[PDB]
Amino acid sequence: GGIERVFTDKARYNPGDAVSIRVQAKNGTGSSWSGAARLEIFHLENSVYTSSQSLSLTNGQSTTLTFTWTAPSTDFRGYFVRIDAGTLGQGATAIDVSSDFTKYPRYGYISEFESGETALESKAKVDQLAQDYHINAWQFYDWMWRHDKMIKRTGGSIDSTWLDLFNREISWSTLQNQIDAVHDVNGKAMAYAMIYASRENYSPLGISPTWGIYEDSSHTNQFDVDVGDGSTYLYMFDPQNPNWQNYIHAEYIDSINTAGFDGIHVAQMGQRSNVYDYNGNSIDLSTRFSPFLDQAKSVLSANNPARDNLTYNIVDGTVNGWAVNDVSKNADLDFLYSEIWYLSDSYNQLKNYIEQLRANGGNKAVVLAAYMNYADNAGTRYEAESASMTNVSTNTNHAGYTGSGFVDQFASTGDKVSFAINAPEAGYYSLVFRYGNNTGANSTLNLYVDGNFVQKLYFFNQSSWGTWKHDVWSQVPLTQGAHTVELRYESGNVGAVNLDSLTLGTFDEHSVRLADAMMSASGATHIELGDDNQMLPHEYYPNRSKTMRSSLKNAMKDHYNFITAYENLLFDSDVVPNDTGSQFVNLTGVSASGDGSANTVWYINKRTSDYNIVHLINLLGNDNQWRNTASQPSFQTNLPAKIYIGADETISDVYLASPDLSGGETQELAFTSGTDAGGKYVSFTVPELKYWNMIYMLE
Numbered sequence: 011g012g013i014e015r016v017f018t019d020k021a022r023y024n025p026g027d028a029v030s031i032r033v034q035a036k037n038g039t040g041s042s043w044s045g046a047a048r049l050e051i052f053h054l055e056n057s058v059y060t061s062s063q064s065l066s067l068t069n070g071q072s073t074t075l076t077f078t079w080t081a082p083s084t085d086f087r088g089y090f091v092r093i094d095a096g097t098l099g100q101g102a103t104a105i106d107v108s109s110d111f112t113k114y115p116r117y118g119y120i121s122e123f124e125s126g127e128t129a130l131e132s133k134a135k136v137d138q139l140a141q142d143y144h145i146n147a148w149q150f151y152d153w154m155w156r157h158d159k160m161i162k163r164t165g166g167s168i169d170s171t172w173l174d175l176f177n178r179e180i181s182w183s184t185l186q187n188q189i190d191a192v193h194d195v196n197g198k199a200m201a202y203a204m205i206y207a208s209r210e211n212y213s214p215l216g217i218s219p220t221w222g223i224y225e226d227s228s229h230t231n232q233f234d235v236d237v238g239d240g241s242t243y244l245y246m247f248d249p250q251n252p253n254w255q256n257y258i259h260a261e262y263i264d265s266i267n268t269a270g271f272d273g274i275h276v277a278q279m280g281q282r283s284n285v286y287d288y289n290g291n292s293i294d295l296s297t298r299f300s301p302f303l304d305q306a307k308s309v310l311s312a313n314n315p316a317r318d319n320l321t322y323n324i325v326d327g328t329v330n331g332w333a334v335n336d337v338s339k340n341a342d343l344d345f346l347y348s349e350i351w352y353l354s355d356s357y358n359q360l361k362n363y364i365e366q367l368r369a370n371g372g373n374k375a376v377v378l379a380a381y382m383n384y385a386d387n388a389g390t391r392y393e394a395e396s397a398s399m400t401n402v403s404t405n406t407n408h409a410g411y412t413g414s415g416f417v418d419q420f421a422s423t424g425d426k427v428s429f430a431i432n433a434p435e436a437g438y439y440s441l442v443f444r445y446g447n448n449t450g451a452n453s454t455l456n457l458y459v460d461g462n463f464v465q466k467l468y469f470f471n472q473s474s475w476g477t478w479k480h481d482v483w484s485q486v487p488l489t490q491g492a493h494t495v496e497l498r499y500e501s502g503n504v505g506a507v508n509l510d511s512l513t514l515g516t517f518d519e520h521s522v523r524l525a526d527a528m529m530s531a532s533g534a535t536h537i538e539l540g541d542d543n544q545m546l547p548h549e550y551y552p553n554r555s556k557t558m559r560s561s562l563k564n565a566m567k568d569h570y571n572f573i574t575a576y577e578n579l580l581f582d583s584d585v586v587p588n589d590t591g592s593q594f595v596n597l598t599g600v601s602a603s604g605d606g607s608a609n610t611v612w613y614i615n616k617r618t619s620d621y622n623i624v625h626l627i628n629l630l631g632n633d634n635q636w637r638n639t640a641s642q643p644s645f646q647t648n649l650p651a652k653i654y655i656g657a658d659e660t661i662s663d664v665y666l667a668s669p670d671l672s673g674g675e676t677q678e679l680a681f682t683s684g685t686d687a688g689g690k691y692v693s694f695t696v697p698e699l700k701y702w703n704m705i706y707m708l709e
């Protein structure tokens with residue numbers, strides 16, 4: 011398919027906006043090509059536009075066609091887009107018509123703001139997410155100077171740079187440029203801010219400890235957060251206290267008006283117990299965010315209804331988890347957001363949590379933060395003891411190492427380890443080192459790639475020498491083919507390490523497709539893409555300890571088209587579970603389950619006013635954790651399926667759309683029904699199941 015890309019200028023359109031569908035093509039079949047480009051746009055199963063254009067290309071040549079469309083007056087509609095060019099190829103994209111991003115958030119992030127970033131580089135990184143995945147809002151992570159003094163001013167004047175709490179340079183022009191670029195794609199820019207945090211030494215800013223929350227009832231220890239340099243701390247505060255609300259809401263408003271943000275992403279540290287105010291009163295923090303969020307929304311909307319967007323992080327998401335009910339039910343948020351840790355590990359546990367959220371929020375959209383392959387050091391491993399070491403030998407004395415051993419006593423000047431690696435395709439590669447360090451402090455080593463120094467690299471001190479870690483990395487660009495990565499213990503390097511391996515930090519395509527399918531099926535979206543086409547590997551968004559390869563980038567384009575086009579079926583306000591009916595799916599040859607059981611095909615049972623919807627999630631040959639890496643599922647071809655229904659439900663037609671299958675185009679299938687011992691049925695053959703099928707049946 012030498013139809014290379016299909017996309018749109020903007021990332022969400024309004025009803026009646028012009029819409030420019032672009033089509034990048036390129037002939038590479040030896041000799042000229044003449045024919046047409048047949049654009050066809052669907053709403054679920056109904057073609058609603060069709061158009062054609064002449065196209066001829068010599069061998070080798072490229073062009074970009076524009077097709078122009080008018081978004082239909084019906085607000086809040088997702089559309090599939092087909093382009094066919096006969097033997098040249100095909101491609102696809104989706105279009106979302108919504109006056110408001112908060113009905114169908116597709117949430118990304120920006121976390122870098124270097125002053126070396128030209129306005130053009132800024133526009134290019136934003137355009138890529140907008141075009142490839144239809145992002146409609148970006149969370150700006152760690153843009154602020156201080157958590158309690160977000161825009162840094164000298165007098166009245168705004169400082170053109172400032173240093174954030176890990177000492178990064180944040181550039182105001184870069185920041186402003188990004189927000190404009192976001193705004194070009196009719197994007198929205200959400201500002202990160204904590205609900206309760208000041209930085210240290212907050213008194214001369216006129217913040218009062220009397221507004222604080224405390225570990226005890228003598229106001230002797232304020233809750234805090236050691237960021238870990240001995241100076242830099244977050245101190246926590248009472249969200250219901252009016253003076254705190256006043257102080258911090260003011261900086262919220264300052265950010266909207268001064269920086270041009272469209273709303274605020276309010277965060278929190280999560281759960282805390284046996285909590286007191288300054289005066290000594292015991293208080294349940296879990297119920298206290300809703301009042302603050304309510305008042306937040308109220309001043310944001312008075313300040314400016316066009317830029318009054320709001321959400322809150324419900325941290326450690328699970329069914330009836332901490333502050334889960336109070337926030338989701340009573341907090342005046344525009345869409346719900348939750349960071350999942352280790353209390354919803356099964357695909358099913360997580361399906362049930364999203365379900366609770368949708369229920370409690372009145373089917374208002376849910377986004378999850380769920381960092382994939384977090385625990386796992388995934389990607390291609392290059393063993394340190396297979397490699398080329400100057401002045402150091404292998405050992406096997408401390409345990410937990412991988413392959414045959416590791417390199418010891420990387421202690422002394424002129425020590426060296428060199429990895430002869432190969433990079434399948436051009437692009438960014440995460441260099442992830444597994445190490446030991448029990449020196450007593452940080453150890454350092456210098457990182458050379460292809461004879462050039464990249465970085466000094468700090469290895470953290472650990473409990474024992476038997477304690478291995480892989481949380482030291484460097485992202486570097488690479489041409490396809492052989493390359494040399496080496497560490498040198500040079501002059502200025504300190505301490506010592508054991509070295510176990512180099513891994514090319516890579517997200518695992520299989521886990522991720524499944525995790526996303528699961529979430530979208532269940533009714534959610536996943537903040538997972540940001541900056542220059544990075545995927546989110548950690549809670550600290552600037553972490554680049556893992557990269558997607560072309561393969562997963564393709565999968566996500568397919569996926570994000572999918573949850574854009576069929577968004578009315580996944581996320582609309584009347585898309586509810588279809589649970590009360592002993593409902594059952596029968597599959598010939600393969601065992602199924604409705605509770606996401608390892609090594610099965612998981613049917614999930616949802617419905618709307620007009621459609622009966624089954625999702626199938628191929629867990630064949632794979633376990634039931636959502637977060638861990640995975641094997642390629644057992645691909646099923648020509649698969650007989652049987653679906654049961656209520657006696658008052660007759661099926662006009664039956665459709666199956668899947669992102670694993672023709673970019674997610676809908677296909678109609680052959681089917682009749684009858685009746686038998688286990689209720690009234692309907693049946694058909696599933697042509698292919700790979701990762702995720704969305705069967706939707708019109709009634």
Ligand SMILES: OC[C@H]1O[C@H](OC[C@H]2O[C@H](OC[C@H]3O[C@H](OC[C@H]4O[C@@H](O)[C@H](O)[C@@H](O)[C@@H]4O)[C@H](O)[C@@H](O)[C@@H]3O)[C@H](O)[C@@H](O)[C@@H]2O)[C@H](O)[C@@H](O)[C@@H]1O
Nearest residue numbers: 152204238277278279323325349379481548549550551553
């Ligand atoms: O020390 C080495 C260490 O470096 C990196 O991790 C840095 C730390 O990341 C996080 O702390 C920074 C983070 O703290 C507050 O927000 C916390 C958290 O809030 C959640 O609501 C949100 O969803 C998260 O995205 C967010 O991180 C501040 O408000 C924020 O400004 C600040 O950025 C994390 O809490 C620490 O544990 C980390 O050390 C590397 O990524 C890490 O591997 C390494 O160990």
Ligand SMILES: [Ca+2]
Nearest residue numbers: 412415416510
């Ligand atoms: Ca090893």
Ligand code: NA
Nearest residue numbers: 633635638640
């Ligand atoms: Na898994």
